[PDB]
Amino acid sequence: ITGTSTVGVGRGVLGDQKNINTTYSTYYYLQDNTRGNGIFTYDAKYRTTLPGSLWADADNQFFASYDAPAVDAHYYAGVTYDYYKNVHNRLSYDGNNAAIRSSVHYSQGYNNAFWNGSQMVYGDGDGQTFIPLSGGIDVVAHELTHAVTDYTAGLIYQNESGAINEAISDIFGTLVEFYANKNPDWEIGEDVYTPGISGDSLRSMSDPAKYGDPDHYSKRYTGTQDNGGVHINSGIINKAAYLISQGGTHYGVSVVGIGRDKLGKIFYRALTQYLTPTSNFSQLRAAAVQSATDLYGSTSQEVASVKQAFDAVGVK
Ligand SMILES: [Ca+2]
Ligand SMILES: [Ca+2]
Ligand SMILES: [Ca+2]
Ligand SMILES: [Ca+2]
Ligand SMILES: [Xe]
Ligand SMILES: [Zn+2]
The missing domain is CATH 1.10.390.10 (Neutral Protease Domain 2)
Structure with a gap:
C-alpha cells in the first residue's frame, strides 16, 4: 500500500521483543519499505487461500499472541534479505529486489512451512510437534533460499x-x-x-x-x-x-x-x-x-x- 514508513514493536513466537518496519495509512501494515521493493506479511486467518490480507494493526504494537508469528515472519525475512545483500551482493531472491511476501496462520495445526512458487507460507504447528514455524530463523531462511534456488540453478x-x-x-x-x-x-x-x-x-x-x-x-x-x-x-x-x-x-x-x-x-x-x-x-x-x-x-x-x-x- 502507499503510506509512510514507520517502526513498530512487538513480540515474536519465542517471546522476544523486536522492532519491525511498518507502513502507516490509517492502519499500520506489516510492510517494510526499507528493503528492495518491500517485505510484506499477510494473515491467512487459519485458511489456505493465499496470500490472505496484508497484516493490519491499529496501533503499531504487536504483542498479541496472534501477532507473534507475523512479527517473526516479517522480521526474519528482513534478516535473510540482509544476509544475501550484505554477504553475497544479492538483492532479494530474484537478484532484482523482488517483493518478499509471507503469509502466517496458514490452515489449522499445520506442521510445516514452504515456498509456493511466489511467497512464503507458515503453519502455526499443532503445538505438539511444532509451534508457529516462523519462530525459527533457520526455517524462514531455508524457505526463502528455495526462491533463490528456483531463480538460479533451478x-x-x-x-x-x-x-x-x-x-x-x-x-x-x-x-x-x-x-x-x-x-x-x-x-x-x-x-x-x-x-x-x-x-x-x-x-x-x-x-x-x-x-x-x-x-x-x-x-x-x-x-x-x-x-x-x-x-x-x-x-x-x-x-x-x-x-x-x-x-x-x-x-x-x-x-x-x-x-x-x-x-x-x-x-x-x-x-x-x-x-x-x-x-x-x-x-x-x-x-x-x-x-x-x-x-x-x-x-x-x-x-x-x-x-x-x-x-x-x-x-x-
Ligand atoms: Ca496492535
Ligand atoms: Ca524441541
Ligand atoms: Ca538451527
Ligand atoms: Ca539455534
Ligand atoms: Xe532473499
Ligand atoms: Zn525445503
Whole structure:
C-alpha cells in the first residue's frame, strides 16, 4: 500500500521483543519499505487461500499472541534479505529486489512451512510437534533460499537434484542463523520443533544420522517417498558442508575446516554459476571444486578441503 514508513514493536513466537518496519495509512501494515521493493506479511486467518490480507494493526504494537508469528515472519525475512545483500551482493531472491511476501496462520495445526512458487507460507504447528514455524530463523531462511534456488540453478525437486536443493536451503538457513547470531547451531528447526522436548530438532547437519538421515552416499535412500528422499538424502550434502566448514574425520576421512564464510561463498557461487536443474551429487562436487578454485586458487587449502569433504561422504 502507499503510506509512510514507520517502526513498530512487538513480540515474536519465542517471546522476544523486536522492532519491525511498518507502513502507516490509517492502519499500520506489516510492510517494510526499507528493503528492495518491500517485505510484506499477510494473515491467512487459519485458511489456505493465499496470500490472505496484508497484516493490519491499529496501533503499531504487536504483542498479541496472534501477532507473534507475523512479527517473526516479517522480521526474519528482513534478516535473510540482509544476509544475501550484505554477504553475497544479492538483492532479494530474484537478484532484482523482488517483493518478499509471507503469509502466517496458514490452515489449522499445520506442521510445516514452504515456498509456493511466489511467497512464503507458515503453519502455526499443532503445538505438539511444532509451534508457529516462523519462530525459527533457520526455517524462514531455508524457505526463502528455495526462491533463490528456483531463480538460479533451478534444481528439480526430486531425487539427487531435490536433495541438493534441500541441502542448499539447510546450508543457507544455517548461515543466516549464524549471521543473526542468536543461539546458532548446525541443527534445523530447533527453535520451533517439539516445544516439550529440549535438545532435539528436525534434522542435524553435524550428524544427520541422529535422526536416521544418511551421512554417506552408500547409505542413500532410493525409494520414491519424499520425492525420492529430498529431505533424507540431503543429510549427505549437509554433512559435506558441515565438514568443509567445521572440519572433522568422518568414516576415516579427515577434512580440514575452512570456516562458515568460505563455505557460504563456495556454495553460493556453485548455486549461481554452476549448478543446473538436473545436477546430481557428483556434479555438485565438481561445481563446488570449481567454485573454490575460482575463489581461492587450484592449490588452495579451500579446494583441498572441498575434495576431502565429498570424499568423506563418498561422493566422487
Ligand atoms: Ca496492535
Ligand atoms: Ca539455534
Ligand atoms: Ca538451527
Ligand atoms: Ca524441541
Ligand atoms: Xe532473499
Ligand atoms: Zn525445503
